[PDB]
Amino acid sequence: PHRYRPGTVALREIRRYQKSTELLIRKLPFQRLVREIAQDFKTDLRFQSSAVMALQEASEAYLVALFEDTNLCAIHAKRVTIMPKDIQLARRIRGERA
């Protein structure tokens, strides 16, 4: 009965995903959200396949970087577990809450 210790697989995932470039969010679900959010701005809309793709590419690129800054904030407070206050602080200094 084998088992990897806490964090050993996490580190492994970090290594894997920083090597690759594939989108990490499942497309269909992402597309639903996009369309849903849009319907609030103009009813009965169509989307070029590439329009949805540009938005997903932009969104993951954004979140990933926000996860980088969040990590730095957790670490600044001598932790290794990112928390909401960490995301809040980052966006706040980014001026996204200013």
């Binding site: 920083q18 470039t21 793709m53 540009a54 670490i75 290794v80």
Partner: protein, 108 residues
């Protein structure tokens, strides 16, 4: 056969006639000098070479011959200056640079 292109005169690969056309129809000024499209095309060609040269090496370094997005990202974010110039740009399918904060590594 003869009428020589402006790009060939300036000894450039980039289209001077087009850069000139694009400056005019761009509404940047009432008039556009003759040298501007030349100078500007020269600058775009140079920068284009700068990135391709670096992205090419990233391709070599990966035992690959065809330059893909990943290669371009690796070339940009690894160059202090190019990285600064594209500090607020996102290269689709570029991924990030491999990087793990030390304090997150297993305590050897």
């Amino acid at each position: 056969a003869k009428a020589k292109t402006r790009s060939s005169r300036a000894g450039l690969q980039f289209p001077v006639g087009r850069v000139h056309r694009l400056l005019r129809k761009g509404n940047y000024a009432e008039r556009v000098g003759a040298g501007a499209p030349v100078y500007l095309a020269a600058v775009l060609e140079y920068l284009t070479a700068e990135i391709l040269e670096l992205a090419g090496n990233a391709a070599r370094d990966n035992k690959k011959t065809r330059i893909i997005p990943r290669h371009l990202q690796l070339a940009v974010r690894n160059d202090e200056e190019l990285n600064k110039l594209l500090g607020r740009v996102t290269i689709a399918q570029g991924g990030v640079l491999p990087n793990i904060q030390s304090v997150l590594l297993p305590k050897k």
